[PDB]
Short mmCIF file of all heavy atoms in Angstrom, two decimals:
data_model
loop_
_atom_site.label_atom_id
_atom_site.label_comp_id
_atom_site.label_asym_id
_atom_site.label_seq_id
_atom_site.Cartn_x
_atom_site.Cartn_y
_atom_site.Cartn_z
N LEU S 1 9.46 -38.85 138.56
CA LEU S 1 8.67 -38.45 137.43
C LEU S 1 9.20 -37.09 136.92
O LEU S 1 9.18 -36.84 135.76
CB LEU S 1 7.13 -38.33 137.79
CG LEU S 1 6.38 -39.54 138.20
CD1 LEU S 1 4.93 -39.23 138.39
CD2 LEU S 1 6.66 -40.69 137.23
N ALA S 2 9.47 -36.16 137.95
CA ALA S 2 9.99 -34.86 137.59
C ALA S 2 11.32 -34.93 136.69
O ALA S 2 11.55 -33.93 135.95
CB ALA S 2 10.17 -34.02 138.88
N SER S 3 12.00 -35.97 136.92
CA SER S 3 13.26 -36.04 136.13
C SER S 3 13.11 -36.28 134.62
O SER S 3 14.05 -36.09 133.92
CB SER S 3 14.04 -37.19 136.73
OG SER S 3 13.58 -38.45 136.24
N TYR S 4 11.96 -36.59 134.21
CA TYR S 4 11.72 -36.81 132.74
C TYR S 4 11.24 -35.44 132.07
O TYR S 4 10.30 -34.85 132.56
CB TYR S 4 10.49 -37.87 132.60
CG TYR S 4 10.94 -39.25 132.84
CD1 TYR S 4 10.78 -39.78 134.18
CD2 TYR S 4 11.55 -40.05 131.88
CE1 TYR S 4 11.22 -41.13 134.50
CE2 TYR S 4 11.94 -41.37 132.29
CZ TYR S 4 11.77 -41.81 133.48
OH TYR S 4 12.20 -43.15 133.79
N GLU S 5 11.92 -35.15 131.03
CA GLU S 5 11.70 -33.91 130.28
C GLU S 5 10.32 -33.72 129.75
O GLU S 5 9.90 -32.67 129.47
CB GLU S 5 12.86 -33.58 129.33
N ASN S 6 9.68 -34.90 129.42
CA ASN S 6 8.51 -34.91 128.79
C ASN S 6 7.28 -34.98 129.75
O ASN S 6 6.16 -35.15 129.38
CB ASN S 6 8.35 -36.01 127.63
CG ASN S 6 8.53 -37.36 128.27
OD1 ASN S 6 9.45 -37.59 129.18
ND2 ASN S 6 7.91 -38.46 127.64
N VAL S 7 7.58 -34.73 131.07
CA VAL S 7 6.56 -34.71 132.04
C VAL S 7 6.46 -33.31 132.54
O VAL S 7 7.36 -32.69 132.74
CB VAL S 7 7.00 -35.55 133.23
CG1 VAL S 7 6.04 -35.41 134.42
CG2 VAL S 7 6.88 -37.12 132.75
N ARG S 8 5.24 -32.93 132.69
CA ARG S 8 4.85 -31.62 133.46
C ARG S 8 3.94 -32.04 134.59
O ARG S 8 2.79 -32.27 134.41
CB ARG S 8 4.18 -30.66 132.46
CG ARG S 8 5.09 -30.16 131.39
CD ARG S 8 6.21 -29.37 131.93
NE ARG S 8 7.17 -28.88 130.85
CZ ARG S 8 8.26 -29.62 130.35
NH1 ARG S 8 8.38 -30.81 130.82
NH2 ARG S 8 8.86 -29.09 129.27
N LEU S 9 4.46 -31.98 135.78
CA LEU S 9 3.70 -32.26 136.96
C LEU S 9 2.98 -31.00 137.39
O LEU S 9 3.54 -29.86 137.38
CB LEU S 9 4.74 -32.63 138.16
CG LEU S 9 5.39 -33.81 137.97
CD1 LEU S 9 6.42 -34.04 139.12
CD2 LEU S 9 4.47 -35.00 138.06
N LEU S 10 1.68 -31.20 137.82
CA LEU S 10 0.88 -30.09 138.32
C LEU S 10 0.51 -30.45 139.84
O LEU S 10 0.08 -31.72 140.02
CB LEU S 10 -0.29 -30.01 137.49
CG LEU S 10 -0.11 -29.59 136.00
CD1 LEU S 10 -1.48 -29.40 135.31
CD2 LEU S 10 0.70 -28.37 135.66
N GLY S 11 0.37 -29.51 140.65
CA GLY S 11 -0.27 -29.71 141.97
C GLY S 11 -1.78 -29.54 141.95
O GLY S 11 -2.18 -28.52 141.51
N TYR S 12 -2.50 -30.56 142.49
CA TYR S 12 -3.97 -30.44 142.69
C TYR S 12 -4.30 -29.44 143.68
O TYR S 12 -3.76 -29.51 144.88
CB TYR S 12 -4.54 -31.70 142.95
CG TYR S 12 -6.03 -31.79 143.20
CD1 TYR S 12 -6.83 -32.48 142.39
CD2 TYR S 12 -6.57 -31.34 144.48
CE1 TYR S 12 -8.16 -32.50 142.62
CE2 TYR S 12 -7.82 -31.37 144.69
CZ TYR S 12 -8.79 -31.93 143.67
OH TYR S 12 -10.03 -31.99 143.98
N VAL S 13 -5.22 -28.43 143.32
CA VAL S 13 -5.78 -27.45 144.32
C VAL S 13 -7.20 -27.41 144.16
O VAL S 13 -7.68 -27.06 143.05
CB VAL S 13 -5.10 -26.09 144.22
CG1 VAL S 13 -5.76 -25.09 145.28
CG2 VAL S 13 -3.55 -26.14 144.46
N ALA S 14 -7.99 -27.54 145.25
CA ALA S 14 -9.51 -27.50 145.05
C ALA S 14 -9.94 -26.00 145.16
O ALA S 14 -9.35 -25.21 145.91
CB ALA S 14 -10.15 -28.27 146.17
N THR S 15 -11.10 -25.68 144.44
CA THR S 15 -11.52 -24.31 144.57
C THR S 15 -12.94 -24.27 144.99
O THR S 15 -13.54 -23.21 145.18
CB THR S 15 -11.48 -23.46 143.22
OG1 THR S 15 -12.39 -23.88 142.23
CG2 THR S 15 -10.07 -23.64 142.63
N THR S 16 -13.65 -25.48 145.07
CA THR S 16 -15.04 -25.61 145.44
C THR S 16 -15.97 -24.56 144.69
O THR S 16 -16.65 -23.79 145.24
CB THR S 16 -15.20 -25.28 146.98
OG1 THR S 16 -14.07 -25.83 147.74
CG2 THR S 16 -16.57 -26.05 147.39
N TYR S 17 -15.85 -24.67 143.41
CA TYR S 17 -16.62 -23.77 142.48
C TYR S 17 -16.51 -22.33 142.81
O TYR S 17 -17.35 -21.51 142.80
CB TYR S 17 -18.21 -24.17 142.57
CG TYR S 17 -18.12 -25.70 142.34
CD1 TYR S 17 -18.29 -26.64 143.26
CD2 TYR S 17 -17.97 -26.23 140.89
CE1 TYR S 17 -18.34 -27.95 142.92
CE2 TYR S 17 -18.06 -27.61 140.70
CZ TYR S 17 -18.22 -28.42 141.67
OH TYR S 17 -18.21 -29.78 141.36
N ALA S 18 -15.15 -21.90 143.16
CA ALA S 18 -14.78 -20.63 143.50
C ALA S 18 -15.43 -20.01 144.71
O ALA S 18 -15.24 -18.79 144.86
CB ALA S 18 -15.05 -19.64 142.15
N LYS S 19 -15.94 -20.98 145.41
CA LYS S 19 -16.48 -20.47 146.83
C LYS S 19 -15.42 -20.73 147.92
O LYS S 19 -15.61 -20.18 149.00
CB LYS S 19 -17.68 -21.42 147.16
CG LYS S 19 -18.91 -21.21 146.34
CD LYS S 19 -19.95 -22.23 146.36
N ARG S 20 -14.41 -21.49 147.72
CA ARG S 20 -13.30 -21.65 148.58
C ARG S 20 -12.57 -20.26 148.88
O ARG S 20 -12.18 -19.64 147.87
CB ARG S 20 -12.35 -22.73 148.14
CG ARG S 20 -11.35 -23.15 149.24
CD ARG S 20 -10.61 -24.37 148.90
NE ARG S 20 -9.66 -24.72 149.88
CZ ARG S 20 -8.42 -25.17 149.73
NH1 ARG S 20 -7.90 -25.18 148.45
NH2 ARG S 20 -7.71 -25.44 150.71
N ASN S 21 -12.37 -19.99 150.17
CA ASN S 21 -11.60 -18.77 150.44
C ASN S 21 -10.33 -18.68 149.65
O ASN S 21 -9.51 -19.66 149.71
CB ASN S 21 -11.42 -18.69 151.94
CG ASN S 21 -10.96 -17.30 152.39
OD1 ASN S 21 -9.97 -16.74 151.84
ND2 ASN S 21 -11.60 -16.90 153.53
N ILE S 22 -10.15 -17.60 148.96
CA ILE S 22 -8.94 -17.44 148.01
C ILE S 22 -7.66 -17.56 148.87
O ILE S 22 -6.60 -17.97 148.31
CB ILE S 22 -9.00 -16.21 147.17
CG1 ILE S 22 -8.09 -16.30 146.10
CG2 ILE S 22 -8.82 -14.90 148.03
CD1 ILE S 22 -8.41 -15.35 144.91
N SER S 23 -7.69 -17.10 150.07
CA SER S 23 -6.40 -17.22 150.87
C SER S 23 -6.02 -18.63 151.19
O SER S 23 -4.92 -19.10 151.21
CB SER S 23 -6.53 -16.52 152.26
OG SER S 23 -7.56 -17.01 153.13
N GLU S 24 -7.07 -19.54 151.27
CA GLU S 24 -6.68 -21.02 151.48
C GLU S 24 -6.33 -21.65 150.19
O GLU S 24 -5.46 -22.45 150.26
CB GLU S 24 -8.05 -21.75 151.98
CG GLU S 24 -8.55 -21.29 153.41
CD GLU S 24 -9.88 -21.68 153.81
OE1 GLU S 24 -10.39 -22.61 153.20
OE2 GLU S 24 -10.49 -21.05 154.74
N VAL S 25 -6.89 -21.22 149.13
CA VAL S 25 -6.42 -21.63 147.76
C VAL S 25 -4.94 -21.21 147.68
O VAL S 25 -4.05 -22.05 147.16
CB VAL S 25 -7.34 -21.11 146.68
CG1 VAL S 25 -6.73 -21.47 145.31
CG2 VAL S 25 -8.75 -21.62 146.79
N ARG S 26 -4.61 -20.05 147.90
CA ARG S 26 -3.23 -19.46 147.82
C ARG S 26 -2.33 -20.32 148.65
O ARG S 26 -1.24 -20.46 148.30
CB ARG S 26 -3.23 -18.01 148.09
CG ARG S 26 -1.72 -17.40 148.04
CD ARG S 26 -1.93 -15.96 147.79
NE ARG S 26 -0.62 -15.38 147.44
CZ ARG S 26 -0.38 -14.21 146.76
NH1 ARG S 26 -1.49 -13.46 146.49
NH2 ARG S 26 0.74 -13.81 146.49
N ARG S 27 -2.75 -20.59 149.87
CA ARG S 27 -1.81 -21.36 150.84
C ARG S 27 -1.52 -22.65 150.15
O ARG S 27 -0.37 -23.13 150.14
CB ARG S 27 -2.62 -21.69 152.22
CG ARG S 27 -1.75 -22.66 153.14
CD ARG S 27 -2.16 -24.06 152.87
NE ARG S 27 -1.23 -24.91 153.69
CZ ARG S 27 -1.14 -26.22 153.55
NH1 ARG S 27 -1.76 -26.87 152.54
NH2 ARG S 27 -0.35 -26.93 154.33
N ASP S 28 -2.43 -23.39 149.42
CA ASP S 28 -2.15 -24.54 148.77
C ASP S 28 -1.15 -24.37 147.58
O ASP S 28 -0.21 -25.09 147.42
CB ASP S 28 -3.41 -25.31 148.30
CG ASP S 28 -4.20 -25.91 149.47
OD1 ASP S 28 -3.62 -25.92 150.57
OD2 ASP S 28 -5.36 -26.26 149.19
N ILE S 29 -1.44 -23.35 146.91
CA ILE S 29 -0.48 -23.01 145.70
C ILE S 29 0.92 -22.86 146.31
O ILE S 29 1.95 -23.35 145.70
CB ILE S 29 -0.92 -21.76 144.98
CG1 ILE S 29 -2.19 -22.00 144.32
CG2 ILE S 29 0.14 -21.34 144.05
CD1 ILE S 29 -2.99 -20.61 143.86
N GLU S 30 1.08 -22.05 147.26
CA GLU S 30 2.39 -21.64 147.90
C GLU S 30 3.06 -22.84 148.48
O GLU S 30 4.16 -22.93 148.46
CB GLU S 30 2.22 -20.54 148.81
CG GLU S 30 1.87 -19.15 148.13
CD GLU S 30 1.63 -17.99 149.06
OE1 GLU S 30 1.63 -18.26 150.28
OE2 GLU S 30 1.66 -16.83 148.44
N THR S 31 2.25 -23.73 149.06
CA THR S 31 2.81 -25.01 149.58
C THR S 31 3.51 -25.85 148.52
O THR S 31 4.69 -26.19 148.67
CB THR S 31 1.72 -25.84 150.29
OG1 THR S 31 1.10 -25.06 151.42
CG2 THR S 31 2.25 -27.01 150.91
N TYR S 32 2.84 -26.07 147.44
CA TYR S 32 3.43 -26.83 146.38
C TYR S 32 4.80 -26.03 145.90
O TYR S 32 5.79 -26.63 145.62
CB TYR S 32 2.61 -26.93 145.14
CG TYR S 32 1.43 -27.96 145.25
CD1 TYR S 32 0.08 -27.65 145.28
CD2 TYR S 32 1.70 -29.35 145.35
CE1 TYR S 32 -0.96 -28.51 145.33
CE2 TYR S 32 0.71 -30.20 145.36
CZ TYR S 32 -0.54 -29.85 145.42
OH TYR S 32 -1.57 -30.83 145.47
N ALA S 33 4.57 -24.68 145.71
CA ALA S 33 5.77 -23.97 145.15
C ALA S 33 6.94 -24.07 146.04
O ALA S 33 7.95 -23.94 145.42
CB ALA S 33 5.18 -22.46 145.04
N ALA S 34 6.71 -24.12 147.31
CA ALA S 34 7.86 -24.03 148.32
C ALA S 34 8.43 -25.50 148.41
O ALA S 34 9.47 -25.60 149.13
CB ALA S 34 7.49 -23.59 149.62
N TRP S 35 7.92 -26.57 147.84
CA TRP S 35 8.44 -27.88 147.84
C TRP S 35 9.97 -28.02 147.71
O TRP S 35 10.54 -28.58 148.50
CB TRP S 35 7.59 -28.84 147.13
CG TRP S 35 6.32 -29.42 147.61
CD1 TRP S 35 5.78 -29.08 148.82
CD2 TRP S 35 5.50 -30.30 147.00
NE1 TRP S 35 4.65 -29.87 149.00
CE2 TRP S 35 4.42 -30.62 147.95
CE3 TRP S 35 5.45 -30.97 145.75
CZ2 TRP S 35 3.48 -31.51 147.54
CZ3 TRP S 35 4.46 -31.91 145.41
CH2 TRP S 35 3.49 -32.11 146.42
N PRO S 36 10.44 -27.47 146.54
CA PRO S 36 11.86 -27.70 146.38
C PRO S 36 12.70 -27.04 147.32
O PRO S 36 13.82 -27.56 147.74
CB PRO S 36 12.11 -27.17 144.95
CG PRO S 36 10.82 -26.27 144.67
CD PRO S 36 9.72 -26.92 145.54
N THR S 37 12.41 -25.85 147.91
CA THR S 37 13.19 -25.14 148.95
C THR S 37 12.98 -25.82 150.19
O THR S 37 13.95 -26.02 150.89
CB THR S 37 12.88 -23.77 148.84
OG1 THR S 37 11.41 -23.52 149.09
CG2 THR S 37 13.27 -23.07 147.60
N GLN S 38 11.69 -26.14 150.62
CA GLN S 38 11.53 -26.87 151.90
C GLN S 38 12.15 -28.22 152.01
O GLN S 38 12.66 -28.51 153.14
CB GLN S 38 10.06 -27.07 152.06
CG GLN S 38 9.28 -25.77 152.22
CD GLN S 38 9.35 -25.27 153.80
OE1 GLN S 38 9.88 -26.07 154.66
NE2 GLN S 38 8.76 -24.13 154.04
N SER S 39 12.43 -28.88 150.93
CA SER S 39 13.09 -30.25 150.93
C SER S 39 14.63 -30.20 150.59
O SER S 39 15.22 -31.14 150.73
CB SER S 39 12.45 -31.06 149.85
OG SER S 39 12.58 -30.63 148.53
N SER S 40 14.98 -29.07 150.08
CA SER S 40 16.35 -28.86 149.38
C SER S 40 16.49 -30.01 148.35
O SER S 40 17.59 -30.53 148.09
CB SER S 40 17.45 -29.09 150.49
OG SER S 40 17.53 -27.94 151.38
N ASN S 41 15.40 -30.14 147.57
CA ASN S 41 15.44 -31.18 146.50
C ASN S 41 14.83 -30.56 145.30
O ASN S 41 13.67 -30.32 145.19
CB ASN S 41 14.80 -32.57 146.78
CG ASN S 41 14.80 -33.49 145.65
OD1 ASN S 41 15.14 -33.19 144.60
ND2 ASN S 41 14.54 -34.68 146.07
N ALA S 42 15.63 -30.05 144.38
CA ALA S 42 15.14 -29.28 143.24
C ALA S 42 14.11 -29.97 142.37
O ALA S 42 13.25 -29.47 141.69
CB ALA S 42 16.24 -28.90 142.29
N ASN S 43 14.15 -31.46 142.44
CA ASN S 43 13.16 -32.28 141.68
C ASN S 43 11.92 -32.63 142.42
O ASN S 43 10.98 -33.31 141.93
CB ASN S 43 13.89 -33.46 141.16
CG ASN S 43 14.45 -33.33 139.80
OD1 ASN S 43 14.42 -32.31 139.22
ND2 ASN S 43 15.03 -34.44 139.18
N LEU S 44 11.86 -32.22 143.72
CA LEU S 44 10.62 -32.36 144.54
C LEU S 44 9.81 -31.06 144.25
O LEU S 44 9.96 -30.08 144.86
CB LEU S 44 10.79 -32.66 145.95
CG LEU S 44 9.45 -32.73 146.63
CD1 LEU S 44 8.79 -34.06 146.28
CD2 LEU S 44 9.61 -32.63 148.05
N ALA S 45 9.13 -31.11 143.02
CA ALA S 45 8.54 -29.77 142.55
C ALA S 45 7.57 -30.00 141.55
O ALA S 45 7.59 -31.06 140.97
CB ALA S 45 9.63 -28.90 141.90
#
């Protein structure tokens, strides 16, 4: 899917109405962000 220029993939992250600990939310953001480097696949992102 990422290979198509007209697609914008987003990673789902829950916030539980902003009650979820922000460090846990950040862990999830950072996990998605690290996908291409962790996989050595620029399109896994």
Side-chain angles (χ1 to χ4, degrees), residues 1-4 6-18 20-45:
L1 296 185
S3 76
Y4 289 93
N6 58 326
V7 167
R8 293 297 179 271
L9 293 173
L10 306 179
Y12 177 108
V13 177
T15 76
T16 325
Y17 306 102
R20 187 169 180 227
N21 194 311
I22 198 163
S23 66
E24 294 169 20
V25 176
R26 181 161 191 158
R27 175 270 176 192
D28 287 347
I29 295 168
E30 290 180 349
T31 298
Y32 285 116
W35 276 1
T37 52
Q38 289 276 356
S39 65
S40 293
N41 183 346
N43 269 6
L44 184 68

